[PDB]
DNA sequence: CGCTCGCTCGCTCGC
């Protein structure tokens, strides 16, 4: 009775696409109606749903999800290639670097840092790329005590606001460096931050260690060695935008199907 | 009688169209009397009411509920066109700006800010906009500790004056432009904030962030870049207010069908 | 057995009219004996009483309970007419203004505040007018941390004391101008505040808006436009109190049977 | 089980002739033991005690309760009369004023202040009069925004000390003249205040209106008109105390059986 | 099973006289073992314990508990008499004052003030006097007026510390003079204050009432006239105190066997 | 069925030896398995464990349990004597002081403070003294809600760290001064606080009243009078440590079999 | 039915090769299905896991787990030997020092300071050392309210980063020196500090006690005595890391089977 | 077959 129901719920959760509350309400909306019409208690169902969500968040990361089912042939039908050609960089090399960084094949340099203000248009593209996946964790830097709130234990962790001070750079260098360690949040919560690809998209200089109020350059070499620098030249135009998911998947599949030379340095040269 | 009673209550709520207790008491109050005379437990009724409210609040976008079956018909039929003609502006540009702010076509301009005294023409417009939508919210600054309370399950979020200290400004700026994040201010407050348009109506200047008890300047640039400037010079006459929903729907349909150029600035131009 | 008894109790409670505790205890006498001899209901009885109170309050108008059966003919018999003649004001114009303000069809001035001497006699008249109705809610400024508290389950709102700040004035201006918004009174308690005729009677100047901890005369024109200015000059002696209901009903009937032209000015015509 | 136990308790209380709680606990010691050994029903007992207190406060105020069937006989048989004769005040006029204030025959003059220093002779009399009534009320002025807390349906009001700030004076002025106002409670609602005889007995000067931290003289005319003035210069000597009930009842009967004409003014004449 | 256990507990509380918790836990512990081995129901046991406590507290008197009948046969035997003789006080007068204060036959003077530090010998003497009786009670004062242990129907009130602000000064004189006062504990607890003798023991100056941030000298005479100042400047030699019950009984018998004349005032005539 | 099982569990717990949770888990752990196989209610098991702990604790005070039953007959047969000879101090005087402090002979002095560095030998002595008793507690300043939260009938308390804030010193002086007080440490847990022997072992100066961040010399006299002081000279010896209960028992026996003079100061006499 | 499942789980955790619940769930496929079909309670499973962990920690120490049964058999084919040859250090001397430090017989030496940047391969070695042991804890030291919370008797603790304030120096010395004390973890939890070594691997300075914003240099001798200086400023190669447990066990066995000179110093220079 | 008290489970507030 209970075991069969739990197995059926696990099978229905595995053979579907439920993640957040909005997606679950938009997809299968009859579950809430059935629960309201039946009994007002589903502890086993809630536990099974939580287990399925944890298995989906810890199972597939980004490489098993960004693999498309059909590679595109027309390179002019993608906005990413046009943006890369207008900015002044190689599109194939950038795609290969992105595929190598998202697969966990770089090593210590597992953090991509961007440059530019909020009027460049890259923030919307980054938000769309972060929301196109299932689990997503935004790094809300609002206090100087706990930098990671609800962004731990997800799929893709990205930062869109907040500046790291001098009291958090020592922890960021060990968290974003790509090492598995168990860290306790508040008191009754102890998670394990694993090595995942985290993209940093801000405006200020991330390598400048802001020691409270001033700026002290005492450990910029490790932050520069374990960090990247991808600058954007051409900004976003008017009447052009809205990053979807099928085009991104096709671009990822085309970049993975044709791998070329991939470099490993700090400052990216003007190639292409 | 449990499942059958819940099904009958759901059917009566779907056919009668009741949202809260006030609407049910004002309209057909026979279902509530029957439920009170029959069983004594109100947990199922509360769960059904919460489910109905959630289904009514989450279903589509904020601009999808303002488009009626009537097309153009008559352009001049509301007080907004008369106010724009008396002050000296264009109606087409204002309609395009409203359609872009309600649909999120600009990306950054997703908040309407007002300025001027109460005897000029803003309080009546705000009251009409709040009364035109039943599922509207208002962030009343009653306390200086946890002012953000009723912020979920609503579309039109109101905003008034008050000593807004530096605390939740960083979380409100990410929600006023278009994002999805949770903000906790007390005990049970874990709830995701959906992207919806927020209207700001105040008598004084709300562009400067207050530092507890004094008006200072710290985060005025993001509020000026995300908010929209709406200056006024004409005085408030007589018989202003009480706008029906049909005129608002006709204006929204005319603005969505007849669109001009796309602009992105703080002030309002008189072109068109 | 239990359902029939509950239905009989609901019918007896609906066919008796329960508005207060003391009146219900002085009128009915076998209800307590029946409840002690039967079961031990509480939640259902409270819900039924709340529903009956809501249906009795929000269902009709406040001006329908003040109509009389015969109009008054002697102008030197009622105390209100004598007070209006001794104060030096028009009686017919004042009656027409009161009838227009009580019907909710006057405009933006839905509140009437008086400013006279200390020991005059208006306090007894205000208390009699507040007690003449069944439901009456006073604005007691006991807890300074919360704004409006005693304002649900009533209709007649009377202000006695309490220093209103800027936030309280801004929250009250949204309801005193004819709008409808949700005002919070505790920790998560939203309720629809409908527009009703609020009568203000105190000795302090209500035009001076306090700016939290200091005094700043900044909200004068809107406070003067959204209200009137009814001052007194004559003083009453001993044996002038004890306002009944037949005289008030006769005065209301005489004012409704003869309605003149209503004006709109802050300064009343001192003629009498 | 509960209804039968409540009926048995009511029958035992009616057959035993119990009125208060302390006397019933000190005398009828078997009823409490039986209630503790059987079912524990405290809510029903509290409701019955509240109903008995309300019935005692409604029927028979102070003159019909503190008036014995036997006469006074000798004039020298009361401490209050001896104190009034030694201080120089009129005894018949004071008795008439007390009978008029305790009977509701004064109208707006329902306030009596007793001016005195430290150990003079009025504090002990006030304490004895407050302790002679089992269900009396005391002004617990221990907080700023927390005025009354235990004075609902109390015909006897005791006052010892406590300077009220400018935030409850407007509510106290309307209640001291025999009115009916709703005060803000410390919980979240508001109780009902009935027109009972409230006496004042402070130590400093009650004529100065404490408006927060200064003295207000512009609004002192109504407080002076709706108040009395009593002075006591005779110090409390040894072998003069112990106020009982038979002497007070005899004094009340002698004052009611011989009423004189007193001038209704601010001060009290000592003629006679 | 439950009735027999309740009867055994009542018998052990009545005839056995089990009042202390540590002694009852160190002696027989069969009731706790039975309650742990049985179910979790303890309403009857709690009611029996409350009834036993009420029966033990019902008794205003300390002479039958402290005074005995065995002869001493010597002048000096207890340490209290030696301390009083070394400090500079009368022996017979002190014994008469103690016998008059322990009997509760004074009337107005029902307080004992002790001047000096806590290391002199007043705290140890108070602890010995409280432990010499079988039923006693102490209530500390840490915050303002919330920490109240148990003192209903007692005869000795403890006062180790507690700085009362300008709020309860007018109520303490009436509560410690010969009347009652309202008590506010947590929430669902309300009682009165009977005329019991409180032993005041402080080290600073209690005559200067702190009014929040300053001093007050307007009602100190009323609190000083209803008390007995006892100067205790002679400190101990090397760990003095620790009086048992036999020594206290012998001292009480020696003080009662030699009674002299003692006046009723505030200043102690130390003439011996 | 339940009573017999509870009696069997109590007998099995008494016929073994309960020390703490870690010792009970390391020794016999079949009680939990038996309780899970028999019943399922954890309340009965918790009550049985509490009864067993109370029965094991109710045996002796502290001096009769810490003193061994084996004589030495020589002054050179313990590590304490060697440490005292190396650091330069009197052995007999130190043993007498320890016997007087552990038995409650000084009265006002009931705390032993060990001053010096961490690598001296005081930590091992403190650990041995804490492990020599079965039930031992510790007071740590980790939580900012309650500093003295470890007080559930503890007979030996050890101090290892924690600042001395201006708040708990007044409560600690009444417990460390030898007086029958009942100070509450949590919420509704005002038990009989007896004068238990407390030991302090820190490296910094514990006589500095840290009032936030500075140091105010105003609450150091009672802590210095109720505490001791010992200035060591020898550091931690290499290859020497881990004192057991045998050395403590031998030292206690040598101090009890050889009693000399007893002083009452900080630095004791070392002549001998 | 749960007793048999608990016994089977305990047996599988004891003799089987399972440590946590994840390994037991991933091992047998039918056991997880049976546990899901039985019940949903996890308290018994958690208790069994805690008992197994306690039995494994009390039975086998860190020496029996870090040392293997077979040696490496190669004095020039290992990662540790290559790192020592590249950094300039002795192999046999380093192995002897490691065996002496990881034995728990030095007295106070329980940590090891390390320098150099994060690109020297120390992070990979720390991750391998943390993954080679089952029970691994972290030092979450960020806020100034809670000191150490993730230390519940961990066998291998790794120090990450954090500004060590000047207040917990005594608590750190009592934990790293083998001082057994019953210190509280947070508020509602407590444990016993056992003598276990904690590894230290970071990039900042451990001697600089950063007290919030300043730097305290008074405490340095205990940190230098209870630590081991290890240089790591020499740059190594790239594309290395990923150390398993077999190599570490072989190195430990080779160091234990061939012991040379062992000293108790601290400043370990690059010998050889 | 009906009245009543003890064992056990459910709604709700404090910390």
From Swiss-Prot, chains A, B, C, D, E, F, G:
Residue span, SF3 helicase domain: 90-245
Which GO terms fall under molecular function for this chain's record?
ATP binding; ATP hydrolysis activity; DNA binding; endonuclease activity; metal ion binding
Cofactors, names only = a divalent metal cation
The alphabetical list of record keywords is: ATP-binding, Covalent protein-DNA linkage, DNA replication, DNA-binding, Endonuclease, G1/S host cell cycle checkpoint dysregulation by virus, Host G2/M cell cycle arrest by virus, Host nucleus, Host-virus interaction, Hydrolase, Metal-binding, Modulation of host cell cycle by virus, Nuclease, Nucleotide-binding, Viral penetration into host cytoplasm, Viral penetration via permeabilization of host membrane, Virus entry into host cell
Q: What's a single GO CC term here?
A: host cell nucleus
The reply on keyword Metal-binding is yes
Q: Supply one GO BP term.
A: viral DNA genome replication
Q: Does the keyword Nucleotide-binding apply?
A: yes
Compartmental location: Host nucleus
Q: Which reaction does it catalyse?
A: ATP + H2O = ADP + phosphate + H(+)
Disulphide connectivity of cysteines? none
Q: Where does ATP bind?
A: 116-123
Q: What is its EC number?
A: 3.6.4.12
Identify the main location. host cell
Give the function comment from the record.
Answer: Plays an essential role in the initiation of viral DNA synthesis. Binds specifically to an inverted terminal repeat element (ITR) on the 3' and 5' ends of the viral DNA, where it cleaves a site specifically to generate a priming site for initiation of the synthesis of a complementary strand. Also plays a role as transcriptional regulator, DNA helicase and as key factor in site-specific integration of the viral genome. Inhibits the host cell cycle G1/S and G2/M transitions. These arrests may provide essential cellular factors for viral DNA replication.
Record note on quaternary structure: Interacts with host TOPORS. Interacts with host KCTD5.
- Protein's name according to its UniProt entry: Protein Rep68
The major lineage groups are: Viruses, Monodnaviria, Shotokuvirae, Cossaviricota, Quintoviricetes
Query: Its gene?
Result: Rep68
Q: Which residues of the full protein are shown?
A: 219 to 490 of 536
């Amino acid at each position: 009775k209970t075991s069969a129901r739990y197995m059926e719920l696990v099978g229905w959760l595995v053979d579907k696409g439920i993640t957040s509350e909005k997606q679950w309400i938009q997809e299968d909306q009859a579950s809430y109606i059935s629960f309201n019409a039946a009994s007002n208690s589903r502890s086993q169902i809630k536990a099974a749903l939580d287990n399925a969500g944890k298995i989906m968040s810890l199972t597939k990361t980004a490489p098993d999800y960004l693999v498309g089912q059909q590679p595109v042939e027309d390179i002019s039908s993608n906005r990413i290639y046009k943006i890369l050609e207008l900015n002044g960089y190689d599109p194939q090399y950038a795609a290969s670097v992105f595929l190598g960084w998202a697969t966990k094949k770089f090593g210590k340099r597992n953090t991509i840092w961007l440059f530019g203000p909020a009027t460049t248009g890259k923030t919307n593209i980054a938000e769309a790329i972060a929301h196109t996946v299932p689990f997503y964790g935004c790094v809300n830097w609002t206090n100087e005590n706990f930098p990671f709130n609800d962004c731990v234990d997800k799929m893709v962790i990205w930062w869109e606001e907040g500046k790291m001070t001098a009291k958090v750079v020592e922890s960021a260098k060990a968290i974003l460096g790509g090492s598995k360690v168990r860290v306790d949040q508040k008191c009754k919560s102890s998670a394990q931050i694993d090595p995942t690809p985290v993209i940093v998209t801000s405006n200020t200089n991330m390598c400048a260690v802001i020691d409270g109020n001033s700026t002290t350059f005492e450990h910029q070499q490790p932050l520069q060695d374990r960090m990247f620098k991808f600058e954007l030249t051409r900004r976003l135009d008017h009447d052009f935008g809205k990053v979807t998911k099928q085009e991104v998947k096709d671009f990822f599949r085309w970049a993975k199907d044709h791998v070329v030379e991939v470099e490993h340095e700090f400052y990216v040269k003007k190639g292409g």
